[PDB]
Amino acid sequence: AHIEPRYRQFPQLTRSQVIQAEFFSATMWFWILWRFWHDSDAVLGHFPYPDPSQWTDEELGIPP
């Protein structure tokens, strides 16, 4: 069939374009989940942040 305009109503839709729309948004969300757990944890950068340098003295002849 063709496509038709309508006056002041909610427009008609095919099921195909809306099912590809749901398919693509859900694959985006699947990519952010299957990227957000699967190998990273990259927003937290794989290394504990070291302190002010050691919070210890005895560093190669510090002055007593």
Partner 1 sequence: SKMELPDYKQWKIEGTPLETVQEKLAARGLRDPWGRNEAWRYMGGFANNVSFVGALLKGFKWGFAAFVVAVGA
Partner 2 sequence: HAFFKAMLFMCSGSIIHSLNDEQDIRKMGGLFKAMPFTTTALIIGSLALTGMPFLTGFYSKDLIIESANTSYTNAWALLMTLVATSFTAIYSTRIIFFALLGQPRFPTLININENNPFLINSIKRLLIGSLFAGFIISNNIPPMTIPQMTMPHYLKMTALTVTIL
Partner 3 sequence: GAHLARRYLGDASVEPEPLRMPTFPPDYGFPERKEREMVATQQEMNDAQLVLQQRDYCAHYLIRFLKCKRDSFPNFLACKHEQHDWDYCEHLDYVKRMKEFERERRLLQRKKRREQREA
Which parts of this chain interact with partner 1 (CB under 8 A)?
Answer: 7-10, 22, 25-30, 33-34, 37-38
Based on CB atoms, which residue is closest to partner 3, 24 or 34?
34
At which residue do the structure tokens 């794989």 appear? 46
Rounded Cα gap, residues 26 and 22, in angstroms: 6
- Residue pair 4/12 in contact (Cβ under 8 Å)? The answer is yes
Query: Which residues in this chain contact partner 2 in the complex, by CB under 8 A?
Result: 3, 5-8, 10-11, 13-14, 17-18, 20-22, 24-25, 27-28, 31-32, 35-36, 40, 42-47, 49-50
